Amino acid sequence: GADGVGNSSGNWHCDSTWMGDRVITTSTRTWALPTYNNHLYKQISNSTSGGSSNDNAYFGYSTPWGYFDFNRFHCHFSPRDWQRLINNNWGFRPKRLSFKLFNIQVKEVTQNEGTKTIANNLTSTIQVFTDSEYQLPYVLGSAHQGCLPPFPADVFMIPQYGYLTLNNGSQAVGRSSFYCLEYFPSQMLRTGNNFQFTYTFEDVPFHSSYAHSQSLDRLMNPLIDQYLYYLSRTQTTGGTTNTQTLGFSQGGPNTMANQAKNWLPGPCYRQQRVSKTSADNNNSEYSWTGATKYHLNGRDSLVNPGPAMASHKDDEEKFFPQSGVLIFGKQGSEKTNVDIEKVMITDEEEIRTTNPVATEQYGSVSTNLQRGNRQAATADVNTQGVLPGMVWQDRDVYLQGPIWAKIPHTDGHFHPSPLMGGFGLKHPPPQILIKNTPVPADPPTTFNQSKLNSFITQYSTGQVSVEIEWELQKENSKRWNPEIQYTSNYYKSTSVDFAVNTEGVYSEPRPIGTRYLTRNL
Amino acid sequence: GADGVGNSSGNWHCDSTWMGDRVITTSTRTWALPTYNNHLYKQISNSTSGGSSNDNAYFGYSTPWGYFDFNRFHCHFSPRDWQRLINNNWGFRPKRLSFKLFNIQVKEVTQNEGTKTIANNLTSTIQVFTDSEYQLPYVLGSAHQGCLPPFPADVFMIPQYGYLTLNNGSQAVGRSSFYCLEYFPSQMLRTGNNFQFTYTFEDVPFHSSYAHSQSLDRLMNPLIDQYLYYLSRTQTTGGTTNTQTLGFSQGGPNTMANQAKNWLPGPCYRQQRVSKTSADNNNSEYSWTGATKYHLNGRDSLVNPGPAMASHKDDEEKFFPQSGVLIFGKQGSEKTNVDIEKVMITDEEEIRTTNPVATEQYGSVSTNLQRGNRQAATADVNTQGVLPGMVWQDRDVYLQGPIWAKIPHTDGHFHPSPLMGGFGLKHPPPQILIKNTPVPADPPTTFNQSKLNSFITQYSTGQVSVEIEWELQKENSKRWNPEIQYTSNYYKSTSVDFAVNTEGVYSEPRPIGTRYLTRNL
Amino acid sequence: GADGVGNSSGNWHCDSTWMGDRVITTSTRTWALPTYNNHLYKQISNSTSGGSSNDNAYFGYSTPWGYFDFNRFHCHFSPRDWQRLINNNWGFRPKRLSFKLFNIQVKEVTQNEGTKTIANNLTSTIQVFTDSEYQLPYVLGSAHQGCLPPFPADVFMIPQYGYLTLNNGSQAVGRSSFYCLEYFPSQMLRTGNNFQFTYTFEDVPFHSSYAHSQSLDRLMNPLIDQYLYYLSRTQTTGGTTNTQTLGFSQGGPNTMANQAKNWLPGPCYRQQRVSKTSADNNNSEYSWTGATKYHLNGRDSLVNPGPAMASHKDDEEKFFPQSGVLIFGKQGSEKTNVDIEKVMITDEEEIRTTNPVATEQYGSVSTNLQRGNRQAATADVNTQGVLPGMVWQDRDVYLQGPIWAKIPHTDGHFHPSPLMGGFGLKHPPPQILIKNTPVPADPPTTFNQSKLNSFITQYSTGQVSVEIEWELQKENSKRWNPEIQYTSNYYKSTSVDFAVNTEGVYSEPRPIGTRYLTRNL
Ligand SMILES: [Mg+2]
Ligand SMILES: [Mg+2]
Ligand SMILES: [Mg+2]
Ligand SMILES: [Mg+2]
Ligand SMILES: [Mg+2]
Ligand SMILES: [Mg+2]
Ligand SMILES: [Mg+2]
Ligand SMILES: [Mg+2]
Ligand SMILES: [Mg+2]
């Protein structure tokens, strides 16, 4: 679209539409875009931000571009719509996206004698493009701040785009890449113009928005014995002189733990157990030393949140895996060393039906060959890669959590469900990059070859709309008794949950997952 | 409609058109809309406004939206047109509505060094929508200020939209609802754009713009006796020793009070009688203690104005029911404890032909079983719900009074004529909500996740037009003698009634009802 | 249908099918039918059952017929299906019914020498008809035992049909009617035969399966004053000598109780308040003396549950109206003077938004004419019939409660929603009457005129299927925040709710209503 200065280039579209097997979410927001980096590209590294350890070293570039991020479920679903989703469906997945930018306003700022003057610069442009061929480092999928706000009335600033390449400490290597975003075709928009983009999601598995009502070790008929036998006795019982024997039994109703089974619990990468009650924990600094890590090219990274494992076993709700769960901040919570009361620790207990508990061993294996003089020895398995016959559930998604991630362009990518939860896509929603076009201030009247460094101070503002179509897998529960449902609490409160307070601040008081409904295994 | 900055988006349309059985009213006004709540939604309650009693406790939200209110007859009818209506018609009802917003101007306000600068912000928008599916609390119908002014030359400010939900004192409950109006599709308008809406009224009964020339107790032929008998004597007359007897008589011309009749006067909910002359009243505070009330979930509300009852009986014009009549303010009258000379108390004496007097008993009922040792006992009926055979008239409408109300979405709704007077509609003219779109001021040049709280100061102004088509029921009076008509008074005055004074202030000097013409019962 | 002895005449059909705006429920059960009254019709009265008081006197007849009763929601909806209904819909109503009887077995019982022999009587019949023209007293709608069991595996006995006519004490009157059910055409079925019937429900209002999120006294805009005035002062404030005055104010945000309003709360018939905690109640017998009653032809009946009124006001959950709520029994609870822990008292608190609290006055009315020597007097209104402008909600329905009732064939029937809750139908599902055809034992070989009184002992058994199609009004909540939903409790339990225990007994642990979702008023 193209029109004049006094004509609106779009309307406000916020609402959800529920049809048969589909839901279409639409959210509109107002954004503001500053000029970033005074129009420059800059080399950055851990030595440019300060510098401390090799584990945290990097090299990259900060760019003068901003970008759009709507990779959080709350950018699309109101809490009520989320409730409608999770209480009634066994699965969902994204199908298509439509994105629009409109009602663009470019503003000039003049700073003289302490006076603050903001005027419309009717002839200035913004630049917008989509990285539809995935030629730039993809930073969506790294759970960054800068998303479309959950509350439609909230105005937000667009985040600055930067990227990383290869480093050796704070230095670049020959394989290090530099990208110039002006080396891309971009649309130029004045105040009368608008931008639109459409995208189709690839076929991805439905997210499992249910919990299992059976455990993997309890799939048998509890009334009938097995025809198969297990070794039940290795030593004679009774008398004074106990000797070697071999006794075999059939597993049955009272020996379910010994029964022959067809399947195995999902893979494990053991995490340390932390109590939500500080007094139950060790008096030492183990946030790093006791952490579960991966080692890549001489540096350690936290495995966070890592493989989908259950948070805790039965009646152990006060424990969580050190870095094995998503942890969200309560409204207004600060960046550093905030108390437990300022965060919301997610609970993945529902997957304990098929997935090992994050803080316990996967199991026990034999480590020797027993004989007359050597007793049978076993060891705990704290890391268990995939085995044939293993089954598992992936991590849940949350209203305030991420939606998708880009699957790394690699030769191998086993079960590429992103570990933070969500949908793994080889070709995800592309990065939408935006910047204010530099407008030079008055040049000298004698030629000078130097690049111009005096610009008129500008920012831009407008509206953004994002529409996502989602496919649903409706609940078909043949269970007799009522199910668990997400419900607001009936009792009297100073404020209503998922609303604004007396000062106009919107808050999300808790994480809301998707696994309320149940099904058999 | 969509056009440029130098082109008008509409014309001024104010006038009435009288046809055969229809009148089309059109009024145009100029409005101004500020930014409300600094773009925020806020939780409000009786503790946020102060707090005193449980009877006045509430919980709700203030929104940054304004709304249009033209739910008063004087927004559509000039006093002369009202006179034409009431002097010539026995009834009327609304049929259709057309609403337009045009000649939108968005203005930026700059406050530096005490200097007041107002400039046009040619690229800013307003947002407008109609709640056509009645998904929001409906506040029209609660006789609020903020209507289109009666005088076409008067410029008005649009009122702020807020709503209530359930409360327990100043606190919310689980059933309490929060609504975000940005969760609705709304049209975005710049200075070249306009908005239009059309609506059709459902079939509603005509308002009875007449008074009855017969009373319910005087429908008989005054020359002829009845064939039916009543009990006229229970004791012998004459002598020294009076004994029990049963004597029966036929009602006739001199015993109309005893005649058999087919109908009953309308229902009653008794109000206290107050004299317009202070000296005739009791020396106590009874505005609340002597008030007629309803009790709902532990709190009392005034029954105001309540069931349509006649204001007073014959030659008792100085008395009014405590809260049983509409009371309007004279021009410029203040909010609190104003004298009687500052208000205009309506008079519903015309309905005393079928409806009980508001301040008297409905009648008398027997309370015992009389016999030799027990005398017949009766009691006053101060509350009388509907009985088969009851007939009544609804409350009159006034030039300065309300037009419609939304019938509550309930299972039962007996004779849903709104008690303040007017037309009860299940699907009334929808709420038209409007706001100024927030325009952020210059954002920081380093990304910050916090919602933006610095905006450019703006307001909007434009024109609004409302057109209503009304259906008329023409007077067909077969009466020989002249009727009562509303007339201006012939005598010399300092000012003419329903005009402006020497300072340019328009005033409405009296309430004007609709019941001048008469008809039989 | 008609077939042989070795061929099944029908299949087991139990399941629900959810479509767009419809749900079809199907339940199949096994029944047993004895011979009732040894094939006789008998006159019954309070003198035939014992006799105590005139309030309990009756006259009627016991018949040898049984009948089918499926007038309870749990005969059709599993608890899970009920949850699906109430969490997702704003209303529902019945549309059509299909009824089938099949796999009929007639059994002969022989009692000789203490030996119990049961054999098939392949040539015996049962008789079945529908009272499709409503020519018999309709006893469905009187909340009787004998319904299709909620649990599909439970086998039930069909109840005996009897009816009442007019009485004067234990005696009949001339207007008393006697009905012979053999004076009707009935189908005769042997073991190879089946019976089918179809019915269509008349247009009835949807049941309101929601609660209001607004109260009737809080429909105003909380930010704006009214243009209307009320009488706020009757006496001067300040000084030593307080005198009569008239002061008027406009209702506003802090005077919501005084604001002019259009509507009135629903009708009232006051009930006594009883605490669920025995120690808070009076130490007297008031179950009858303190009861709310109606008086009909010299006898008193309890008003039970009576007009739909709210059970209690805010923070008063321990109180219930004496006979103003439905009270269900827990599984196995006995007929007489059972403890509070054996019953389940329903709570109608959700309707307090429009309906008066059952145990409080409707309001207050004026009872006199105040003047200099007479102070303003008011009285409580404990009975309030319908007034124009009243709005209300009807009583909720429950999973274990009744579905419909027959509207009495009368000249007048105001808002004929059955007071126990449910759907009022002029032409309800007809009575389905069934009996075992008498099979005489060996007659004498010499003629005797006396009716035969020696029969072979028989009973019958078979299956019954009932299919109801229901229309739904889907929830379209534009509320931002999550709603209340019915949910099973997440915590560990010895048994799961709405399941069987270790002995195979099914129980319904609580009443489940339909008002979880909310909407504005
Ligand atoms: Mg977000
Ligand atoms: Mg847990
Ligand atoms: Mg690659
Ligand atoms: Mg007005
Ligand atoms: Mg008068
Ligand atoms: Mg409603
Ligand atoms: Mg039952
Ligand atoms: Mg309650
Ligand atoms: Mg009848």
Author numbering:
A (entry chain A), B (entry chain A), C (entry chain A): 217 to 737
Quote the authors verbatim.
AAV is a small single-stranded DNA parvovirus that attracted attention, because it infected humans without causing recognizable disease. AAV-DJ is a recombinant chimeric mix of natural serotypes 2, 8 and 9, selected from a randomized library for liver tropism and immune evasion. Like the natural type-species, AAV-2, it attaches to extracellular heparanoids and became a model system in our laboratory for studying the glycan interactions. Alternate splicing and start codons result in three viral proteins in ~1:1:10 ratio of VP1:VP2:VP3, where VP1 and VP2 are N-terminally extended, the larger VP1 including a phospholipase A2 domain implicated on entry in endosomal escape.
Here we report an analysis, now complete at 1.56 Å resolution. By FSC0.143 gold standard, the resolution is estimated to be 1.56 Å. Inspection of the map clearly showed the presence of a first hydration shell of solvent water molecules bound to many of the polar protein groups. In the absence of cross-validation methods, modeling was conservative, adding solvent molecules only where peaks in the map exceeded 1.8 σ, totaling 265 per protein subunit or an average of one water per two amino acids. Presumptive divalent ions could also be seen, coordinated by histidine ring nitrogens. Here, at 1.56 Å, the AAV-DJ structure is refined with a full complement of hydrogens, most of which are clearly defined in the map. The 249 atoms within the nine strands, βA–βG, of the core subunit jellyroll approximate this, with mean B, = 3.3 Å2. However, the quality varies from excellent in the β-barrel (CC = 0.88 for grid points within 2 Å of the 249 atoms) to marginal, the marginal regions includingthe 24 disordered loop residues with breaks in backbone continuity that are only breached in the unsharpened map. For seven of thirteen histidines in an AAV-DJ VP3, the map indicates which nitrogen(s) of a histidine side chain are protonated; two others show the entire imidazole ring, but without distinctive hydrogens at Nε or Nδ; while four exhibit disorder that precludes imidazole proton assignment with confidence. Thus, we are observing, at 1.56 Å resolution, the effects of local environmental pKa perturbations of the nitrogen atoms of half of the histidines.
